Design a protein around this ligand. Structure first.
Ligand code: NTA
Ligand code: FE
Length: 339
């Protein structure tokens, strides 16, 4: 009847859930795992981050489910169709938020149950507990628990190997989040976020000691001085976009991915790293930084870090299984890339 969310708040599970508000649109990644062939049927509103910041995934859904464009966008901008203060008109049974608000207050003041999850700041600790909570409060425990089993299995395949690797034998690693996005450079993950995936994949994240939190910045000069064994760039850029950025996602091929990475690797400063010269330079889909599908990032990283140990591991296969079992769309495009 009650469950504890990732804020440690006790929440009363509603007996009927037909109407789900997503405080962050990209929480749809999690919800989608639960809704089988009816992904949108219970979504009554969402913030626009999925539609606006994941145009590629949105577009694939829109192809098969045009109704996605009718889902109200909650926010205060001209791109939004319903302001926080009026979200009660949507009659949500429950509202889902990330840990990372006037909206939350408005919903709590209306007696709407609010559940906090987290795939962003501490994914290693919080991914699976988040999914468990979601299975319970959205009445999809079978789907949650099967996903939990699938994720555990697929993570173990890595960690049963990477946990036995001595630290001195581990590659040093630097991930540049949204490489080529802002003008200043080297937004990264430290004690959390994609850091967790580096850790689980047997890497040594050079930003871990440089940052107090999960997310932060390391100046290029420090990246260049440290000169890690491995360089990773995250991005989710449209393959039709000339702005610098790694093009990855549902609508990107390998060749477009490689090409856009190459532009990122050719940047002044970055092009002097040994990792770039050695070709130990890689691209990862940015939205794995806030998604329960992050098992695929862990598997990708492991393959880059220990290519021999993970010769037979194929994240594209892992992804295929995830889609087959849980999702109403087919897997397409490119979510990781090598030089
Ligand atoms: O999440 C957002 O609203 C915007 N992002 C970029 C992105 O996620 O594409 C910055 C950040 O989360 O630091
Ligand atoms: Fe972001």
């Amino acid at each position: 009847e009650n469950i504890t969310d990732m804020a440690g708040r006790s929440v009363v599970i509603p007996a009927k859930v037909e109407r789900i508000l997503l405080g962050e649109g990209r929480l749809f990644y999690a919800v989608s795992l639960l809704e089988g062939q009816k992904p949108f049927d219970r979504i009554v509103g969402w913030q626009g981050d999925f539609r606006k910041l994941d145009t590629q995934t949105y577009a694939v859904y829109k192809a098969k489910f045009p109704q996605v464009d009718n889902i109200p966008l909650i926010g205060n901008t001209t791109a939004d169709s319903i302001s926080p203060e009026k979200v009660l008109t949507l009659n949500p049974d429950i509202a889902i938020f990330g840990l990372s608000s006037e909206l939350v207050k408005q919903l709590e003041k209306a007696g709407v149950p609010v559940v906090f999850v987290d795939f962003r700041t501490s994914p290693l600790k919080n991914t699976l507990p988040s999914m468990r909570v979601l299975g319970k409060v959205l009445h999809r425990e079978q789907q949650a628990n099967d996903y939990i089993k699938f994720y555990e299995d697929n993570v173990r395949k890595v960690t049963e190997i990477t946990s036995k690797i001595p630290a001195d034998k581990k590659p040093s690693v630097f991930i540049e989040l949204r490489a080529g996005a802002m003008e200043e450079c080297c937004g990264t993950a430290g004690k959390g976020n994609m850091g967790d995936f580096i850790d689980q994949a047997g890497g040594n994240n050079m930003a871990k000691n440089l940052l107090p939190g999960a997310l932060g910045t390391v100046n290029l000069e420090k990246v260049l001085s440290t000169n890690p064994d491995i360089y990773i760039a995250s991005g989710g850029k449209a393959p039709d976009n000339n702005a610098p950025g790694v093009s990855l996602g549902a609508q990107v091929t390998k060749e477009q991915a490689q090409s856009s990475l190459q532009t990122i690797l050719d940047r002044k400063g970055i092009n002097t790293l040994s990792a770039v010269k050695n070709g130990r330079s890689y691209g990862i889909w940015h939205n794995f930084y806030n998604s329960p599908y992050n098992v695929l990032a862990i598997q990708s990283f492991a393959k880059w870090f220990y290519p021999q140990q993970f010769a037979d591991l194929d994240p594209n296969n892992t992804m295929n299984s995830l889609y087959s079992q849980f999702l109403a769309i087919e897997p397409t495009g490119t979510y990781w890339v090598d030089s």
